[PDB]
């Protein structure tokens, strides 16, 4: 028996430089995990290596996870840290869109509820 992710979905990363957001081509996975100290972790894993390469401890009202309407060739989402300039960008990698909005809802619900 092992603790399971609260939500997970396939997604790649993108990087912002200056004003330009450019995709990273790797297959990845966004997930939210509650560790046994009750803390909530927003994570990104490289699906090819299996390496967890982002692991952020998030508290209620730190963040919003929002669709980015400025990109028409993908389903791009941003984890925005409301207090400063920190932003993490992701592009959905599920073949269909029919769970995108539910995944977005669940991310916001788990990050912003105590």
């Amino acid at each position: 028996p092992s603790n399971k992710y609260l939500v997970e979905f396939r997604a790649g990363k993108m990087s912002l430089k200056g004003t330009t957001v450019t995709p990273d081509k790797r297959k990845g996975l966004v997930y939210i995990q509650q560790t046994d100290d009750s803390l909530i972790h927003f994570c990104w894993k490289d699906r090819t290596s299996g390496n967890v390469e982002d692991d952020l401890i998030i508290f209620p009202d730190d963040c919003e996870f929002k669709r980015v309407p400025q990109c028409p060739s993908g389903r791009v989402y941003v984890l925005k840290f409301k207090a400063g300039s920190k932003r993490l960008f992701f592009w959905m990698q599920e073949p269909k869109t029919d769970q995108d909005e539910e995944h977005c809802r669940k991310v916001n619900e788990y990050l912003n509820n105590p």
């Binding site: 396939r10 790649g12 993108m14 912002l16 004003t19 330009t20 957001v21 450019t22 995709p23 990273d24 081509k25 297959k27 980015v68 400025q70 990109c71 060739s73 993908g74 791009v76 932003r87 960008f89 592009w91 959905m92 990698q93 599920e94 073949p95």
Partner: peptide, 14 residues
């Protein structure tokens, strides 16, 4: 498995 989408094009964020 079903083919995953191609990466999006770069875009402007300000």
């Amino acid at each position: 498995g079903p083919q995953e989408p191609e990466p999006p094009e770069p875009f402007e964020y300000i």
